[PDB]
Each structure stands twice: as structure tokens, then as C-alpha cells.
Design a protein around this ligand. Structure first.
Ligand SMILES: CCCCC/C=C\C/C=C\CCCCCCCC(=O)O[C@H](COC(=O)CCCCCCCCCCCCCCC)COP(=O)([O-])OCC[N+](C)(C)C
Ligand SMILES: CCCCC/C=C\C/C=C\CCCCCCCC(=O)O[C@H](COC(=O)CCCCCCCCCCCCCCC)COP(=O)([O-])OCC[N+](C)(C)C
Ligand SMILES: O=P(O)(O)O[C@@H]1[C@@H](OP(=O)(O)O)[C@H](OP(=O)(O)OP(=O)(O)O)[C@@H](OP(=O)(O)O)[C@H](OP(=O)(O)OP(=O)(O)O)[C@@H]1OP(=O)(O)O
Ligand SMILES: O=P(O)(O)O[C@@H]1[C@@H](OP(=O)(O)O)[C@H](OP(=O)(O)OP(=O)(O)O)[C@@H](OP(=O)(O)O)[C@H](OP(=O)(O)OP(=O)(O)O)[C@@H]1OP(=O)(O)O
Ligand SMILES: O=P(O)(O)O[C@@H]1[C@@H](OP(=O)(O)O)[C@H](OP(=O)(O)OP(=O)(O)O)[C@@H](OP(=O)(O)O)[C@H](OP(=O)(O)OP(=O)(O)O)[C@@H]1OP(=O)(O)O
Ligand SMILES: O=P(O)(O)O[C@@H]1[C@@H](OP(=O)(O)O)[C@H](OP(=O)(O)OP(=O)(O)O)[C@@H](OP(=O)(O)O)[C@H](OP(=O)(O)OP(=O)(O)O)[C@@H]1OP(=O)(O)O
Ligand SMILES: CC(C)CCC[C@@H](C)[C@H]1CC[C@H]2[C@@H]3CC=C4C[C@@H](O)CC[C@]4(C)[C@H]3CC[C@]12C
Ligand SMILES: CC(C)CCC[C@@H](C)[C@H]1CC[C@H]2[C@@H]3CC=C4C[C@@H](O)CC[C@]4(C)[C@H]3CC[C@]12C
Lengths: 574, 578
């Protein structure tokens, strides 16, 4: 019924510019009919111009299809050579054959993608020429389609069908022991992008969890206004995790809408990947659990059950929700996340891909959870001078604060060793080491504040200068090296890059301003939380700023993924 | 992919028997493949049997297609005659003719979809046979017979469709093709149309808020001047009825019961079950908020009694909102149906009017609560004067829905002139009048020294038994069409059942048996003062049960009505223009 929306929803992002400009053709036809008042001569001239544009688009489609055909043939030849080599070779062999199977599946997916490209282009050409015929009341569009479009190489080439059949047969005969069902179970390509909406049950569950979360938040606010353990420092981590999951669902939705191929960037399975709806569902469920635990703490209806059981259990459930061996709840994604976390926490011993660095950055923005965990350990170790945990600073607190920065710094060092490109990796390593310097100097100042060493005023100046250095370093890296903004090629996009996938420039400008403000706020919050510093209002400031840090990292995720998709800023791809 | 499910979802329900039996062919293919051990000759014999079955299916499909095409041509001829008559006459007539033309176009599109689906199924099943048998003879059979069958080689339907579009856009749309193809487009129909994502999200959000608010209300009641039960029972029953009606719509869609045709709704624009669910969720959210405000009374200045009224007022406004928003089409249709029902004698009784009258019969508790709240406001504002004593107006208001159904049955008898069904139904509704009147007489005479109260008590018990038996028998035999003599396998049922499980039918029968007596007891208790102590609690408990019973009854009555259309192969409405 409507081909503009169906097409745009089915466009392959990386090939967006190579499809027929159906919307442009619509605008051209509508404008031509709008200016219609000699008159027949003008109509004939418009017809000639329209069909010249059609020929140009058809030629573009043909050249793109020919290039993709050559690429697919080369890929098939390479895959056959690899299969022969693996067969000659036959733990390591199993991994090799699995990688070969994955490569064959990816190549088949590419063939399906280009077949869909061909079908969509032909359908768009036919529909636009039908619209031309209907608007201009002429039977010449069909003649033009039959004369050239019907005989165009892109529509008359069946090499892709033969390649698909050959790939299927080869996989079935040399990778699945002659079973076609198993081969097609992995080769089949379901609808991609936004073509397949999320299940109705998933959306209903997301809505149910959102409603329960909203009502429970209202109830919590009412209980707090009306109505032994620090509840803020125990529940801030959970609240931040829920907020991060919700903002990550928003990030995934925006990436899908803007054509940012985060599936390829994150190296996820394109045939089956988690969507924003599932992230919203998980965030809503975790928020429901968090709200229930906090309400139980506020009320404690059961006396036999101590209050401290409620927080622990909540966070225990969360742990049990992530390390569950059973294949019940997002098991594929949960196992992938577990592997990524293991790689990140063992950063120097694994090659650093985009996913590892991205998760390490997320942890950098989520250090408050580790700080709260360490504070809970301190509370259970000593407090259970009364408030000794938050009144003094120790090295363990500083190293716990710097753990995410340490992980990122070691990742950058490993990347430098692997690639030897000193500039980016070492500049990023220094950016992360500014965090170590700032935290150490803040801890020294806090320790010296208690005793009159006479060298506490000099430790404060060092902390101020290193705070400024770290803030400027992080902001510059975020604006220039992460988002790729402030580029010379952006003639029409001031303070941006040449190409921006997102619709509005206001998004980018507000992002720059918010990045600066919340970078300063994040540095301040890290300074406050790492050490005693403000002994009275520090906790409130940290609690207020941590959600702002999560929001800043969410916007940063948006723009970092955008830059990575447009330009290989992270150099994680060939 | 998954062509069996696609065929099941896209088949026209009334033509279910007339499609290619894809699942049956799959069964034959799988059974033959498993039975494979002389092997080649056995395979050839199975292939011959499969081709014979395919030939039978092709002949049946061709015959059905020819019959439907002939019906379409006759309908087009009649429509052209009506158009000529209208031209000779030359607003309501033009609108009715436009509706008839749109319905004919819908029927043509349905027949074309039937043809395309049958051909695609024939191709898919023959491809499956080729794959399983490792032979290409099925493709040859498809080419020789399926691709040359009259049902697939006849493009007369496309020409008829084009002629219909031209006629509509010329003689009705004033030579505009934009107004045409908007009245007659036939978007995806049946269960093949997914509901909007935002609608599902709103349904979920409303359900979650409703659940949490209900939990809060229960906690407040268990841990923390105006009868709240009477005030809010009507609203709770309305919310429950809306939720169960959404369930009814979902089940009708899944089972293929074409409620759209039975209710005479527009096939192109239908209210999905999720829309009903979200409406019920929002109404329940408002009801829970009002109840919580009554309980806690957060605003001291605002009196408690304002909270319910407002809610109900909003509810009324929600139904009365003249603005073209918030299901304005469905709301206006419901308002017209209600106006027809409450003025039954002066309007022709369709299925929708009788169905809504029955729904109101199951929802008499709302009217009773309204009357009680009128009495309380008039008199109370002798403690409990309204509750302790009853009057004739109470019984009359109780019998109102039964009066509506009885007069509808009388009108149906007057129109059709058939005396069995309509007058037996009228007697079954008059039993309610007798029972209510005798209950009221006994309750009135209990307080006074009539000296014949026991006689009226015995009369009330006799007529209560009579009414319960009458309603139960009518529900089981007439409404649900069960206990039919032609039931071969489905004992105590009819020959053909649209729902997957007969256990559902048996459980529904038992539940109706119990709940008809429960509903009669509830009506007796509410209408009079038989049980002044526990009567209110009994009525409150029974009213949701009455709504559940009228939900199950809706299921089975709609199934029974749809089976008649299935037998008649009537997939579209019969439009008459005056
Ligand atoms: C400081 C303390 C800890 C801080 C928090 C730690 C971790 C959470 C952070 C990020 C989660 C991953 C975000 C994915 C981003 C990429 C885009 C995308 O959406 O990708 C998703 C990946 O889904 C995920 O990874 C899971 C999403 C998160 C679910 C949360 C589970 C519960 C966690 C409990 C918290 C644990 C600590 C206890 C509390 C103290 C695509 O899924 P797929 O199925 O295509 O996956 C690929 C699978 N193949 C390749 C085999 C097909
Ligand atoms: C004693 C009090 C009685 C309580 C009220 C009981 C029932 C009213 C609701 C529904 C009855 C009709 C249902 C028909 C069955 C098929 C399912 C379906 O609903 O399908 C619908 C038909 O139904 C409806 O439109 C029902 C409308 C529902 C709107 C909600 C209004 C609620 C108002 C609340 C009242 C407040 C009272 C409180 C004061 C005490 C099909 O949708 P369409 O878009 O094809 O509609 C047709 C529209 N064309 C003709 C243009 C295509
Ligand atoms: O509205 P009408 O009745 O006057 O004519 C409509 C009709 O064109 P027709 O006369 O056959 O040439 C549709 O064809 P159809 O789906 O049946 O298909 P096929 O016959 O199978 O090809 C077409 O859909 P589409 O197929 O191009 O998506 C639609 O385009 P529209 O919504 O604008 O959407 P856009 O594509 O421009 O975004 C036209 O609407 P209008 O142009 O607004 O008036
Ligand atoms: O992703 P992979 O292909 O690299 O690895 C697959 C492999 O196991 P691994 O993780 O390598 O240790 C399969 O068995 P395997 O070792 O005999 O290997 P082969 O496929 O013969 O090479 C296993 O099938 P199973 O026995 O559980 O059913 C499957 O599990 P699971 O997700 O539940 O998926 P399902 O199979 O249930 O769909 C894994 O994922 P996927 O194939 O993508 O699905
Ligand atoms: O590869 P497989 O074996 O897993 O699936 C095959 C077959 O299933 P099988 O195993 O024989 O039982 C078909 O029926 P099915 O299982 O979905 O149906 P049920 O619902 O159970 O009836 C399936 O869909 P479909 O033809 O019915 O729509 C079709 O897929 P696909 O490429 O989309 O074919 P096309 O639609 O584009 O023609 C494949 O046909 P082959 O070309 O012969 O390989
Ligand atoms: O569609 P019909 O032709 O069968 O009936 C339409 C007709 O109502 P009638 O019976 O004559 O009283 C229109 O009034 P009219 O004669 O002044 O003018 P027109 O020449 O038709 O424009 C009315 O306003 P309008 O929408 O068209 O401007 C429109 O409302 P509806 O679409 O609901 O509302 P919205 O689209 O605004 O939300 C009705 O659409 P139906 O939904 O199908 O009933
Ligand atoms: C108050 C100010 C400082 C905060 C910074 C502005 C916020 C509101 C801006 C910064 C980046 C923006 C996002 C950037 C990209 C997208 C993807 C798009 O498909 C939908 C909108 C969405 C999701 C934007 C929403 C608004 C947003 C979050
Ligand atoms: C009270 C005791 C004796 C019996 C209770 C039986 C209830 C649970 C039975 C009676 C009628 C049944 C319904 C009959 C028809 C359908 C439609 C189907 O597509 C889904 C199930 C559904 C919705 C059934 C669910 C179960 C049901 C509601």
C-alpha cells in the first residue's frame, strides 16, 4: 500500500545511498504536477527528465550489483579454498571447522541481503513508474520499464540464486554430514532490522513491568515522605544498574532507527540478536525487584526476616539472574555478557575488540557500584567511632575506585603492543592514568587533612590541577577521538563531522554541552566518592551525580557507536 | 516458511472446508515416508494415491471457485441495477448503495485471496511431495493440472474487480479515485493482522498499574457513612465485563468465529481485543484510584462521595464524548446499539441488539446499584431504610433487562411470525418477571401480617426452579446448539465444534448449570430482602460469577451462530438499499 515506509524500513543501512531514491522520485513527480499550468511540451520535457533520472538510478543499481556479484564470487572461492584446507588438515580442528561454518553462514547472509536488494530495487522501480503513469495519465512508464528495466543486468542476473544453491549444497555436503535441515537451520535469514517487530507478549511484558515500576516508585516516594543500615549506599548500585539497562535499551532503539550497524560493530549474531524491547523488559523486572526490596526495607512487614536480608537477596537474585546455567532467560545474551566480562576483567590477556573496550568504558561510568560494594564490605567488617567507614580513607578504596580506569589503561597498553600505533592507544592510556593521579592525590590530601603535616595545602593544589587535567583530557577525547566531531570536512555541520546519521544538529550540540558539564560533574563525583573530601554533603552529591554519569555515558554510547559505524575510530575493523 | 500456519491464519473461516487440506497431505506424506521399508512399487502406489487426492482437491476447489464467481457476477448485476435505479431517482440511499458496493468488493477480494491461497498451497504441497519422494513428478502434476485449472487460469475476478472500481469511482465518488480505494481496499483481515506495538504496551502498562493498585487496595482494606460496596460494584463489574469481552474477541479471532460478520461490523475497520483490554485497564485504573481516594481521603476538603461520582461521570463522559477521539467509531456504534436496545419495540432486532440486551441482563447489578444509590441519596441523605425495605420500583428496575429481552422476542415474533423460538424465549424471560414479583411479594408480606406469606414463598421457590431450568435448557440446547442428535463423536454436543477441546464444552456446561442457579439466587437476593444480613455479600460475590457465565455463554453462542454461516458459506453481509 505504501512503498516509501516499507522500503526505508527494509533498506540495508550500509547500502542506503545505493537504492532507488523512491522518495526523491515522489517529490519530483509531485512538484512537476504542482507547477503544471506549450503545456504539452513542458509535460514531455518533464517526462524526458524523469526517465533520464530513472536511467541514471538503474545504471547506479547495475554497477553496485555487479560489484557485489564480484565480491560474492571472490568470497565463495575463498570459502571453498578454506574448506579444502580444513578438510586436508582433518580442539583446534573443531574450532577451525566452526569458524568455517560461521563464515559460510555470513556469506549466505550477504547473498540473501543482496537478493533482497535486487528485489526491493525492482519493486521500487516498478511502483514509481506505475505512479508516473497514473499521475501523468500515460502508458509510457510501462514501456520504459519493459524496454530497459526488464532487461537490466541486475534483474536479469540469476548468479545469486546459483550462488545461494551452491553454498547450501556445499554446507550440507561438507559441514553437516549431508543433512539439509541442520544446514538450513543456520543458513536461513529471518527478517532483518525493523522488518520483524518484537513479539506482542514481549511488548506486553515490558508495559506491565513499566507500570508496576512506576506505581512502586510512587509508593516508595509516599512511604519515604510519610513512613542501622545505609539504604542509599546499598540501593544506589541497583538503581544505577537499572537506569543503565533502560538507557541501553534506548541506545539500541536509536541505533536501530538511525541505521547504525551495532550488530556488526559488537560482532553479534545478525540472524538472532537482542532488541531494545528485551532490554526494557529486563530493566523493568530488575526495577520491580529493586522497588520491592526497598519497600520491604522501609516497612519490614516480616519481623523474623532481618532487614539486611532484603538488599542482599535482591543483589543475590541479580547475580543468580546473570550466572544462571540453565537455558531459560536470555541465556545466549547472558553467556555472551559473562564471556565479555571475563575478558574485560582479564584485559591484558585477551585481544581487545570493540565489545571489550565498550564494556570497560561502561564500567568506568559505573564505578559507583564497585564503590558501594566496597563500602558494604567495610560496613560489615568494622561498623558491624561508629561511622568509621565514611570518615577515613585507605588505599583499598582508591584502588577500587581506579579499577575500571586500570582495566581501560591496561586494555590500551595491550592494544598499543598489538598494533604499535603509539598515538591513539598511548594518548588514551594517559587519559585513563590521569584518573589514577587524581584519585591518588585526592586520597593523599584526605589523609593529610587529619594530621597537620603542613603539606596538605600543596596536596590540594595538586588535586585541583590534576582534576582540571583529567576533565580536559576526557572531554577532548570524548569530543574528538570518540565522537569524531570538530572536523574540517563539516562545511554544512558546524562543530561536527561531514556525515551525521542522526536527524537533528540540536542533538549533537546539546550532547557536546552535556558532555562537558557532566564530565566535570563526573570528575567531581569521583573525587568526592573516592575519599572523604566533603564529609557531610558528599554522599548526596555522589547520589545525585551518578545517574547523571549514567546519562552522560548513554549519550556517549550513542555518539561513539555512530562514529564507529561511520569511521573506524576504534580501529577494530579492517 | 511455516505454510500450514499461514494457511490456517489466512483461510476464510466460513470457507474452511473449501480449502486445500495441507495438513492432511502432510500427514499422508509423513506416514508414507515412515512406512517405507518392492519398495519402489510401494512408493509409486503411494504417489498415485497422493495424486488422486490432489485431483479430488483440485476438482473441489474449481467447483467452489466457479460457484463463488457466479454468485459474484449475479451480485454485480444486482448492484448495477440498483445503481441505475438510483440514477433514475436522481442521500441515505446513496450511502447504502456505497456500503453495498464496498461489501461486494470485499467479497471479490476474499474470493481472489481464496484462489491465490489455494494455488499457493497446491504448489507448496506438490513441492513437499517432490522433496519427500525424491522425485519431480509432483512438479509435473502441478504444471499439467494445477497451473491449467479453471480456478487459476480464469482472470474474470480481476476484470470484475476493475469494473467495480470504475463504477464506484465514477457513479459514487464523483470521478475521484482517492475516495475510492479508501472505502474499498480490504486490508489484511482475520488473525493475520498484528496489533500495534504501542497498543500492546499501553495494555501492559494499564494491567500492571491495575494489579499494583488492587494489591494496595487489598492491603489498605486488611490493615486500614457511605456504602462503598454498592457504589463500586457496578464499576468493578463493568471493568471485568470489558476484560472478558476482550478475551471473547481474542478467542473468536483464534477459533475463526467470524464475530465481525455476526455483529454486522465493518470488516475493514475492527476493534482488536487489545483495544478492549486497554480500555478496561484504563477504566480499572480510574476505578482503583477512586476507591483509594475514598479509603485514604487524601484531600480533607473534598468530600469522599465526590470521588466515585466523578469516576462514574468520567466513565459516562468517556462513552458520551462527542469528539472524534478515543475509539469514537466504536463508541458511536455502541451508543446507537444501546439506543436501539433500550427502545427495542420500535426497531428491527438484529443479532447485535439481542446480544447487547443479553449482556445487560447479565449486568442488571449495575442498574440495581444505581437504583440503590438513588434511594440512599433521596432518603438516607430509620437507619438502612433503603436496604431494610423494598418497593415495586426496585423489582421493576431489576426486571428492566428482562423486559427489554422479552419485548425484543415479541418484536421478533411479530416480524418473522414463527412462534416456537421467539415465544419460548419470551416465556423464558417472563419467568424472570414471575420470580422477581413473587420474591417481592413475599418480602413485603414478611414484615406485615398478610397471613399468606408462606404461599408466596412456595410460589417463589417453584418459579425460581422454573426460571433456572428454563434458562439452563435454553442456554444448552438453543443458544449453544449442544445435545444435538447428529453428534457422532462429540457426545452431548453437536456434530461440528470449532474449539480445540471438548473438555472446554463439558466444563462450560457444568459451570453454566451451577451459575444459572447462582444468578437466579443473586437476583432474588438483590431485588428483595430475603437475606438482609448476608444478602449484599452474596450478591457481590455472585455478580462477577454472573459476568463470567455471560462471558462463556458469549463464547459458545457466537460459535453456534458462526456455524450457521459456515454451513451457508456466508462470508459477507447482505446489504439492502432502500
Ligand atoms: C560494576 C558491577 C557490574 C556492572 C554491570 C555489568 C554488566 C552490565 C552491562 C552491560 C550488559 C551488556 C550490554 C549489551 C550492549 C551491546 C548491545 C546489545 O544489545 O547486545 C546484546 C547482548 O546482550 C547482553 O549482553 C545482555 C544484556 C544485559 C542483560 C542483563 C543481565 C543481568 C545482569 C545482572 C547484573 C550483574 C551484577 C549484579 C549486581 C551487583 C545482544 O544480545 P544477543 O543475544 O545478540 O548476544 C549475542 C549472543 N550471541 C553472539 C551468541 C548470538
Ligand atoms: C448495565 C451497564 C452495562 C455496561 C456496559 C456494557 C457493554 C458496553 C460495551 C460493549 C458492548 C458491545 C460489545 C460487542 C461485542 C464485540 C466486541 C467488540 O467490542 O467489538 C467492537 C464492537 O463493540 C464496540 O464497538 C463496543 C465499544 C466499546 C467502547 C468502550 C465504552 C465503555 C463505556 C463504559 C460505560 C460506563 C458505565 C458506568 C456507569 C455505571 C468492534 O469494533 P469496530 O471498531 O468494528 O466497532 C464498530 C465501529 N464501526 C461500526 C464504525 C466499524
Ligand atoms: O490511493 P489510490 O487508490 O488513488 O492509489 C494507490 C495505488 O496505486 P495504483 O492506482 O495501483 O497505481 C496503490 O497501489 P497498490 O498497493 O494496490 O499496488 P500494486 O498494483 O500491486 O502495484 C499504491 O501503493 P504502492 O504499491 O505504490 O505502495 C498507493 O500508493 P501510496 O499510498 O501513495 O504510497 P507510496 O508508494 O507513494 O509511498 C496509491 O495511493 P496514492 O498515490 O496516495 O493515491
Ligand atoms: O554458536 P555455535 O554454533 O558456535 O555453538 C553451538 C554448539 O555448541 P557450543 O556453544 O560451540 O559449545 C552446538 O552444539 P555443538 O558443540 O555439537 O556444535 P555444532 O553446531 O555441530 O558445530 C549447540 O547446540 P545444542 O546441542 O545446545 O542444541 C549450540 O547451543 P545453543 O545456543 O543452545 O543452540 P541450539 O543448537 O539448541 O539451537 C551452540 O550455539 P548455536 O549453534 O549457534 O545454536
Ligand atoms: O528447509 P526446510 O526443510 O527447513 O523447509 C522446507 C519445507 O519444509 P519441510 O522440511 O519439507 O517439512 C517448507 O515447508 P515448512 O516446514 O515450512 O512447512 P509446514 O508449516 O510444516 O507445513 C518450507 O516452507 P514452505 O514452502 O512450506 O512455506 C520451505 O522453506 P522456504 O525456503 O521458505 O521455501 P519457500 O516458501 O520460499 O518456497 C522449505 O522448502 P524447500 O525448498 O523444499 O527446502
Ligand atoms: O465514510 P462514509 O462516507 O461512509 O461517512 C462519513 C461521513 O459521515 P455521515 O454518515 O454522512 O454522517 C462524513 O461526513 P460528511 O457527509 O459531511 O462528509 P465527507 O464527504 O465524507 O467527507 C464524516 O466526516 P469526514 O471524516 O468524512 O469529513 C466521516 O466521519 P469519519 O471518517 O468517522 O471521521 P474522521 O475521518 O474525520 O476521523 C464518515 O466516515 P465513516 O467512518 O465511514 O462513517
Ligand atoms: C538537557 C540536555 C543537556 C541533555 C542533552 C540532550 C539529550 C536530551 C539528547 C542528547 C542525545 C539525544 C539522543 C540522540 C539520538 C537519538 C536517536 C533518535 O533516533 C531518537 C532521539 C535520540 C534518542 C536523542 C534524544 C535526545 C538526546 C538524549
Ligand atoms: C467453574 C468450572 C466448573 C469450569 C471452569 C471452566 C472455564 C475455565 C472454561 C469454560 C469455557 C472455557 C473457554 C472456552 C473457549 C475458549 C477459547 C479458546 O480459544 C481459548 C480458551 C477458552 C477461553 C476457554 C478457557 C477455559 C474456559 C473459560
Amino acid at each position: 500500500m505504501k512503498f516509501a515506509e516499507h522500503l526505508s524500513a527494509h533498506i540495508t543501512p550500509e547500502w542506503r545511498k545505493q537504492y532507488i531514491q523512491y522518495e526523491a522520485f515522489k517529490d519530483m513527480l509531485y512538484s512537476a504536477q504542482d507547477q503544471a499550468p506549450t503545456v504539452k511540451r513542458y509535460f514531455a520535457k518533464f517526462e524526458e527528465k524523469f526517465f533520464q533520472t530513472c536511467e541514471k538510478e538503474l545504471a547506479k543499481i547495475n554497477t553496485f550489483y555487479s560489484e557485489k556479484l564480484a565480491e560474492a564470487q571472490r568470497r565463495f572461492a575463498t570459502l571453498q579454498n578454506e574448506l579444502q584446507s580444513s578438510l586436508d588438515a582433518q580442539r583446534v580442528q573443531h574450532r577451525n571447522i566452526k569458524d568455517l561454518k560461521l563464515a559460510f553462514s555470513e556469506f549466505y547472509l550477504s547473498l540473501i541481503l543482496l537478493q533482497n536488494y535486487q528485489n526491493l530495487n525492482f519493486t521500487g522501480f516498478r511502483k514509481i513508474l506505475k505512479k508516473h503513469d497514473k499521475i501523468l495519465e500515460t502508458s509510457r512508464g510501462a514501456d520504459w520499464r519493459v524496454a530497459h528495466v526488464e532487461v537490466a543486468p541486475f534483474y536479469t542476473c540469476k548468479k545469486i540464486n546459483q550462488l545461494i544453491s551452491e553454498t547450501e549444497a556445499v554446507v550440507t555436503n561438507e559441514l553437516e554430514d549431508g543433512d539439509r535441515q541442520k544446514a538450513m537451520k543456520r543458513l536461513r535469514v529471518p527478517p532483518l532490522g525493523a522488518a520483524q517487530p518484537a513479539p506482542a507478549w514481549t511488548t506486553f511484558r515490558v508495559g506491565l513491568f513499566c507500570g508496576i515500576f512506576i506505581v512502586l516508585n510512587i509508593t516508595l516516594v509516599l512511604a519515604a515522605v510519610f513512613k542501622i543500615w545505609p539504604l542509599i549506599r546499598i540501593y544506589r548500585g541497583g538503581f544505577l544498574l537499572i537506569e543503565f539497562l533502560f538507557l541501553l535499551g534506548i541506545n539500541t532503539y536509536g541505533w536501530r532507527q538511525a541505521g547504525v550497524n551495532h550488530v556488526l560493530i559488537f560482532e553479534l549474531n545478525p540472524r538472532s540478536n537482542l532488541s531494545h524491547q528485551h532490554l526494557f523488559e529486563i530493566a523493568g523486572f530488575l526495577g520491580i525487584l529493586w522497588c520491592l526490596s526497598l519497600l520491604a526495607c522501609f516497612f519490614a512487614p516480616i519481623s523474623v526476616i532481618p532487614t539486611y536480608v532484603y538488599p542482599l537477596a535482591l543483589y543475590g537474585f541479580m547475580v543468580f539472574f546473570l550466572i544462571n546455567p540453565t537455558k531459560t532467560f536470555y541465556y545466549k545474551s547472558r553467556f555472551w555478557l559473562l564471556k565479555l566480562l571475563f575478558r574485560v576483567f582479564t584485559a591484558p590477556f585477551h585481544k581487545v575488540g570493540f565489545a571489550d573496550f565498550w564494556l570497560a568504558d561502561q564500567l568506568n561510568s559505573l564505578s559507583v557500584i564497585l564503590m558501594d560494594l566496597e563500602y558494604m564490605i567495610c560496613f560489615y567488617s568494622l561498623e558491624l567511632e561508629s561511622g568509621i567507614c565514611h570518615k577515613y580513607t585507605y588505599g583499598v578504596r582508591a584502588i577500587v575506585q581506579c579499577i575500571p580506569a586500570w582495566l581501560r589503561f591496561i586494555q590500551c597498553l595491550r592494544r598499543y603492543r598489538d598494533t604499535k600505533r603509539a598515538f591513539p592507544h598511548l594518548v588514551n592510556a594517559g587519559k585513563y592514568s590521569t584518573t589514577f593521579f587524581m584519585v591518588t592525590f585526592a586520597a593523599l590530601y584526605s589523609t593529610h587533612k587529619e594530621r597537620g603535616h603542613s603539606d596538605t595545602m600543596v596536596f590540594f593544589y595538586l588535586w585541583i590541577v590534576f582534576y582540571i587535567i583529567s576533565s580536559c583530557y576526557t572531554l577532548i577525547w570524548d569530543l574528538k577521538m570518540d565522537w569524531g566531531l570538530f572536523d574540517k570536512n563539516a562545511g554544512e555541520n558546524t562543530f561536527l563531522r561531514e556525515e551525521i546519521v542522526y536527524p537533528q544538529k540540536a542533538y549533537y550540540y546539546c550532547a557536546i554541552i552535556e558532555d562537558v558539564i557532566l564530565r566535570f560533574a563526573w570528575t567531581i563525583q569521583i573525587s568526592i566518592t573516592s575519599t572523604t573530601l566533603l564529609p557531610h554533603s558528599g554522599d548526596i552529591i555522589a547520589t545525585v551525580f551518578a545517574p547523571l554519569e549514567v546519562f552522560r555515558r548513554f549519550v556517549w554510547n550513542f555518539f561513539r557507536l555512530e562514529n564507529e559505524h561511520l569511521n573506524n575510530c576504534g580501529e577494530f575493523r579492517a
